Amino acid sequence: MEVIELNKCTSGQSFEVILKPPDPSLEEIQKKLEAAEERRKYQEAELLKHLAE
Amino acid sequence: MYTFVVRDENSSVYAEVSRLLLATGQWKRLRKDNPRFNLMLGERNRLPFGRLGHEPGLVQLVNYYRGADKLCRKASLVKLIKTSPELSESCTWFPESYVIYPDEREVFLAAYNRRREGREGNVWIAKSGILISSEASELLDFIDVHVIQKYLEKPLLLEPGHRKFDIRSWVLVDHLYNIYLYREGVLRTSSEPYNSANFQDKTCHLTNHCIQKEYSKNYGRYEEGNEMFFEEFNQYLMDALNTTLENSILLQIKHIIRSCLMCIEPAISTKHLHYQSFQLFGFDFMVDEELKVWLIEVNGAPACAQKLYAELCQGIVDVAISSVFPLATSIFIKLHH
Amino acid sequence: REIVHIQAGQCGNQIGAKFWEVISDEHGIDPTGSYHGDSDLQLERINVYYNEATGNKYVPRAILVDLEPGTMDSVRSGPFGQIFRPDNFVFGQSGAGNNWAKGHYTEGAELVDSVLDVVRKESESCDCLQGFQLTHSLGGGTGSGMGTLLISKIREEYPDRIMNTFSVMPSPKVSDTVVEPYNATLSVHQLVENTDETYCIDNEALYDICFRTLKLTTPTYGDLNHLVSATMSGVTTCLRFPGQLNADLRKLAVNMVPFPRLHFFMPGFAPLTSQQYRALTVPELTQQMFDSKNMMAACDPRHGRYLTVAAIFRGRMSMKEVDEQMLNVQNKNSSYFVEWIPNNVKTAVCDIPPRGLKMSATFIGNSTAIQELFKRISEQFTAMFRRKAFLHWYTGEGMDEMEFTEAESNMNDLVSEYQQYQDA
Amino acid sequence: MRECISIHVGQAGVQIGNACWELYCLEHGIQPDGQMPSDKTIGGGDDSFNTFFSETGAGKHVPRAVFVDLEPTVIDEVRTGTYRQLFHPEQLITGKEDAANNYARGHYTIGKEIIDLVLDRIRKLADQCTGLQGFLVFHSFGGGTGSGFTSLLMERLSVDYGKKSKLEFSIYPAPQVSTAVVEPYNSILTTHTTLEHSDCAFMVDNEAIYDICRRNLDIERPTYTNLNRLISQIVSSITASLRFDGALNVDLTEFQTNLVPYPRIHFPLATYAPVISAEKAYHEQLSVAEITNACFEPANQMVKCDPRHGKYMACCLLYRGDVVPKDVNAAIATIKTKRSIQFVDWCPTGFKVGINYQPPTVVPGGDLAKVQRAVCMLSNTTAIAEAWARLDHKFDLMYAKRAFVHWYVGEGMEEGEFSEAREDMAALEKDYEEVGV
Ligand SMILES: Nc1nc2c(ncn2[C@@H]2O[C@H](COP(=O)(O)OP(=O)(O)OP(=O)(O)O)[C@@H](O)[C@H]2O)c(=O)[nH]1
Ligand SMILES: Nc1ncnc2c1ncn2[C@@H]1O[C@H](COP(=O)(O)OP(=O)(O)CP(=O)(O)O)[C@@H](O)[C@H]1O
Ligand SMILES: Cc1nc2ccc(F)cc2n1-c1nc(N)c(F)c(Nc2ccc(C(F)(F)F)cc2)n1
């Protein structure tokens, strides 16, 4: 039970007690976003083609 | 209408417990993986405790205490007793044991030399398919996770037969952590005389039921199945030793059961948990020449004596299952605490 | 989030008429579209189904379609006839002769474009249109044949919108002509492809409920339509009244439809009293709403499995008892719910009860037992198609036998797809 | 002084955000009109509360917060509620059509169309900051917007604010409150995509908050307002160190330093006590030892799990009220002998303790009674992995049949993202296992 680094201020107090010692780029993001948009666009085209038949 | 699931097909005890449940017209069995269950008779290998108690509107109960393996694994039991102040290394009812990896290698030898130098009983036993020897070199070469323990060189021998035995006690712990000791035990006896100078003849030194059937000279000679119940054993202690089973042995057994279970209660209790646990335990004891009881092992997936499956299995339903899920002279001894 | 309503054919317009008569009463709107309610809860989501005309008059966002004028004249002369937008009556004079080909290919084709003009006009006046709901029967010609034609062309103009139908399935018990199985089989395939949610209303179930439960000797279509309008009111409670859930057709489909083609629901309603003054407890409401006798598809749910279930409780009632009873019916009969969709039962509540009831419960089940309705239609179809009986009515409109063979084939595929998610 | 920008996404994030900023104003003495009479530096200042509130020449204290939802029902309640005066229009972003409980719809379809607008509105707040620390992101796991759009926003934030910290407050789905059958899908999808972008995430299981509201507040059917007021108390206890004078957790970086040794395992468990019903009117005040003891009771945790069967990597105790270091050390010594507390071998067995003397403030007329002292424990324990296990299992049940997958594929997401996300979670579960063996 050791108390270390005790800091005191008007608002409160803090300390430590030891009991025992021991990314994707912007372009890459817009890529996958556009890829998903093209897959939706392709699926919608197939539907419209199906309805045209 | 209560619902339960069965996830351990090999369980003899709970196969009967499930039998009684269905036989009450108020319990229904579900698929193995149906999560809307009140009771789980779970598997003994990686039971998913983390998925219990999250079904809204279902009070869920399971037949195992998460964390009870510390007491039911031979390596864990030694470490639990040595490092638990409630039990202490000076524990008087547990044989001097040492855990060793193929660590307590130098500490086992530390006391070993004292026994060979003083010509004392230097017979030890290695457990985890075991080896009883009187030389450390022979024990360690066999290891190459095991535990080494002093062999009880002066055990109590039943007469006639001059034979060794061990006592199995069944203990049920419910969701309230009440400790119920089944009033009916069993002695698993060996048929052949205890040969103190031949530690290789496992028949006279191992009381296991499987060893006696396929490895014995007079299996079922004195009692059918090499199993003596408390009735005969008590009458024997009276006729032969002028004492009772309660006084000479049962007081120590109840003491040991309480000590072990109360030690781990803070670690496994489900008092304030989102699900409840109970579990049936099997305590194995050893009795020496002076009527001193020693704790051999504890197993959390134990079987029962054929003659006692009915009485004990319904005792489980009444004390552990119906106590949480009602339906509309006790066979257990409540160890108070 | 506006919804555009369409009712097509005799059955569609007579049921649709009663629907608007019912919910117009629940929202306190009189036949002249003038609001005379009591609570602001009535008007909070009024815009989902109604357009607000200048002067604080509310006009249903509904389009009435038929290939003959008889039924829509009786609607315009009916109780709430004046409430509908006059320009939203779109009708021809020839009729469809209970003929799917006439509704879908000949007579209907001649009229469909003008229906789409009215649909487009209503959509343009939507802040954020979310989809459409169509009321129709499948056994006739206009609702079935032209109704499905409409759905196909609506999908073409609004492919990212939700399509929802209340589809009355024919039954020999309550039949007008022998060709109903032909018309229903041709339509069901259209529905498989071109709707997101279809409430299956079996005229057989409606009849049995009127006879057996309501003790109505000699039920009429009017009696049948009372069950349907009451059921349609409950099923749309969330879309019409304030509650935790929003009036969202997409979220409903997202949670109810695990596989695209399996979007055919069994509706139920409770109570159903012959006694009407006695109060129902929450346990009674819950038990009845799950009872087969209270469901409208003439399918035994015990014969299949629930993929998902939606329930609505209306009225002042113990929320705690509701949750308890719902959790009870599940945990007590958990074998009839698929175990590979966790927590597939949703419960909704609404303080405002339907007219004349202290409390009500509506059931919306996506069950694999619905297959026996499609198998029933498929058996009747084949009994006649084996002999090409009555086909000349259809080949005379330009159809050929291959299109019938394909519809039969599509129907049996639908049945087998249900069979694989129940017992292999 | 370094500013913190709060971002609230979807219904859960926005409604919890509303409860938090309400509590902030009460704690800091800021009236609903934004005026703060105790602040004597009008229109400026670098006080601790300025990390969350900017100031205008007129003396209005404006939260450094952005609200984002794809439908305007929820956010319209902010711009018309008690604290409508605090926020200006640019801080509230509403779309027309929501994500319909669909991660893919929120991430790909709708996310792509509004991400730039959100980032621009955020950039506006950042421009007011002299030394931006980073962001606090509130959102649900289960909602289409909370899951799908948050993951997209977190990616772009890592791109546009690379050196800035990002902390999460995430609402874990519970059927008692659940709104959709597919929430396990959305939870796994958004965790996989957000994992490398979040420095420290505080998970809150609606099941735990729900039960706490029923047992401790005696509320039979807790509402979102009940839940969010209790959640805001926990959030307040966690952010107090950024808004008040102190020496513990004084900037966002310190949260990672003190609570997250391994970066992927950045989900510390929160435990709060005491939660007392306001209908009591005369409750016996719990002591420091008693409230500290309650921090090791599973029934007080923000996520139901058994820390007895895990390993601790760090532990912070955040007290508010009448607490002096002496009583804290006494309670820790007592609890250490009674309870099971195992740390990983490569970490010291200790507690960082912070004390703020101002006792917790409760919203007038709410359900929580005012107490003389309260504590929030932040412990990074492997036991929280039980929550991932539950979630992943429900995922596995549905995905084995591909149930509902067509709704996600229909939005442009590939079916492979399901398996990738699930595989990432399988690794996460394995990371916890190695640590807590
Ligand atoms: N604790 C708490 N949870 C909430 C609240 N609102 C919603 N939730 C939870 O959040 C999940 C649903 O996500 P939402 O945030 O409502 O949905 P969303 O982010 O708005 O996304 P979409 O509506 O699909 O566009 C469910 O699990 C709810 O239980 C709230 O106010 N408090
Ligand atoms: N220290 C010791 N001294 C004397 N005998 C011992 C001993 N340790 C074990 N034995 C004997 O070895 C037998 C088996 O030891 P063990 O504890 O491993 O049983 P077991 O675990 O293999 C089967 P069970 O789970 O039913 O007990 C005991 O029944 C006992 O007779
Ligand atoms: C529009 C509407 N009418 C309803 C009537 C009854 C009802 F229960 C829900 C209703 N919804 C509705 N509206 C929303 N806004 C939703 F988000 C939503 N979600 C939902 C639905 C079903 C399940 C499942 F569990 F059944 F699968 C799960 C989640 N359901």
Ligand SMILES: Nc1nc2c(ncn2[C@@H]2O[C@H](COP(=O)(O)OP(=O)(O)O)[C@@H](O)[C@H]2O)c(=O)[nH]1
């Ligand atoms: N429930 C109900 N069913 C109807 C009604 N009118 C017709 N039907 C059914 O609808 C089918 C006939 O279709 P109908 O709508 O009359 O033909 P349409 O005008 O060409 O669409 C048959 O199955 C009838 O049983 C009605 O008012 N109520």
Ligand SMILES: [Ca+2]
């Ligand atoms: Ca200032």
Ligand SMILES: [Mg+2]
């Ligand atoms: Mg054993």
Ligand SMILES: [Mg+2]
């Ligand atoms: Mg007709």
Ligand SMILES: [Mg+2]
């Ligand atoms: Mg939302």
